[PDB]
Amino acid sequence: PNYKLTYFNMRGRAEIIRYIFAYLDIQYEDHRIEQADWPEIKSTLPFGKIPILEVDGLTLHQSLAIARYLTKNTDLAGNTEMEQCHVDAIVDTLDDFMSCFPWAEKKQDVKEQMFNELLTYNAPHLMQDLDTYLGGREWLIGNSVTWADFYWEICSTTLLVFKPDLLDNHPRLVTLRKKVQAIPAVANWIKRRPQTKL
Amino acid sequence: PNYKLTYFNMRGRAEIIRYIFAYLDIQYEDHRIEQADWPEIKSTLPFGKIPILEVDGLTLHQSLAIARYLTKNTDLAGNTEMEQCHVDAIVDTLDDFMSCFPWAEKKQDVKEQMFNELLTYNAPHLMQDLDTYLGGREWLIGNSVTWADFYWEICSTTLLVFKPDLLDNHPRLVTLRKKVQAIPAVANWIKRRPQTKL
Ligand SMILES: N[C@@H](CCC(=O)N[C@@H](CS)C(=O)NCC(=O)O)C(=O)O
Ligand SMILES: N[C@@H](CCC(=O)N[C@@H](CS)C(=O)NCC(=O)O)C(=O)O
Ligand SMILES: [Mg+2]
Q1: Which residues contact B140 (CB under 8 A, 6 or more apart)?
Q2: Which of A17, A20, B22, B54 is such that its CA lies 20 to 30 A from the CA of B42?
Q3: Are strands B3-8 and B29-33 parallel, antiparallel or unpaired?
Q4: Where, in this chain's numbering, is glutathione bound (chains A, B)?
């Protein structure tokens, strides 16, 4: 089909979709809107939220729903129904934590305090749980890369902006990031994508 | 398969799994724990959260990952890949909203204020978006019931505890709740499940 992804000019919640299209070598329109565009665009959306992916004229929404759709019947999905469950579960665990952050908080002092508390008091527990889950394995699930590995690299990239030492006790989680970033199609996307804070 | 579900004695995030088991007529251990014996159990769980489902000795986590695993290759999944994406997306839209509520927030003042703000301002927008999405159709996705309709019924049941007038302007959403509740296997489970507030 023809694909049109609509999101802000940010990695954010679209980036997982962008990595999947890159890895699979699938062409798509990467439509990046400005804030000034938002009201007009929002009025068309099913639940007033982006990203959305238009597929031959039909709208999909929810970043992870779309990610899962794009990876079905590909080597990124997980090799068994059980492993597909593990992929989903790891992704939702990461997403649950990312959703704790007050990204829309206007009071900058309150926002900063909350970010620093989450990254200092809460994040280390998740990092240890992830490290223990990965153990000595090459990838989070199965014997080959899945979109859970991609989501780890995406989420950790943003977390590292606010907490540079996040992974100083977890070299195995850094190695995993590096392994994702070394995949040629992914490396190419990372190199060429617009440089945005988030 | 041999299934053991572990959660609190609460509908909460386990209820969607319980509906799927009931609808599919699958036998399982409904293991309900208390906060007293939690830290014993918590330390053994992969990411320190419940629900978990043990399948033939193997542990799965994340309620929606589990729900999806159980509905794969059943009539509850959605009839095309695109429709399966729609199911997933509705479920995450509902979950995103339910997860905004600070359920475990001990600072009484912010909890009361947040609940009130989500229910007064956000909830009516979501109800309008859902009603518009449903339109005149019988089920949320496709021509038959999916686990997205189950999740609607479950989420709305909890929202109605806090906002009884939630669906005053949305008869079609109430009709959908009743259609789910009238499915014999679901009806039976609703009748026999422990009566909890949440
Ligand atoms: N869980 C959803 C969350 C979508 C979401 O909340 N998107 C934000 C932007 S990142 C949005 O559209 N907010 C509404 C607004 O900006 O008015 C997903 O991953 O797609
Ligand atoms: N998105 C996860 C949420 C898991 C979660 O946060 N569960 C809560 C209970 S509803 C929990 O285990 N909290 C940790 C604790 O009580 O220490 C899921 O749906 O499984
Ligand atoms: Mg989620």
Answers
A1: B86, B87, B90, B130, B133, B134, B146, B148, B149, B152, B176
A2: B22
A3: parallel
A4: 7, 13, 38, 48-50, 62-63
SS (H, E, C) A62-122: CHHHHHHHHHCCCCCCCCCHHHHHHHHHHHHHHHHHHCCCCCCCCCHHHHHHHHHHHHHHH
How long is chain A?
A: 198
- Tokens 């609460």 label which residue? B10
Which DSSP symbol is given to B170? -
Under 8 Å between Cβ of A71 and A77: yes
- The token pair at A61 is 């929404």
State which approach was used to obtain the coordinates: X-ray
Separation of B189 CA from ligand 3 center, angstroms? 26
Tokens of A196: 């945005």
Helices A123-134, A81-98: axis angle to 10 degrees equals 160
Provide the residue type at A3 as one letter: Y
Instruction: State the CATH class of domain A75-182.
Output: mainly alpha
Residue A168 dihedral angles phi and psi, to the nearest 5°? -65, -25
CATH 3.40.50.12780 fits A1-74+183-198, yes or no: no
Dihedral sign from CA coordinates of A55, B69, A95, A153: negative
Residue pair A150/A20 in contact by the 8 Å Cβ criterion = yes
The single-letter code of the amino acid at A50 is I
Spell out a b/e string for A7-34, using b for 16 or more CB atoms within 10 Å of the CB, else e: bbeebbbbbbbbbbbbbeeeebebbeee
Helix (H) / strand (E) element for B4: namely: strand B3-8
Boundaries of every domain in chain B: 1-74+183-198, 75-182
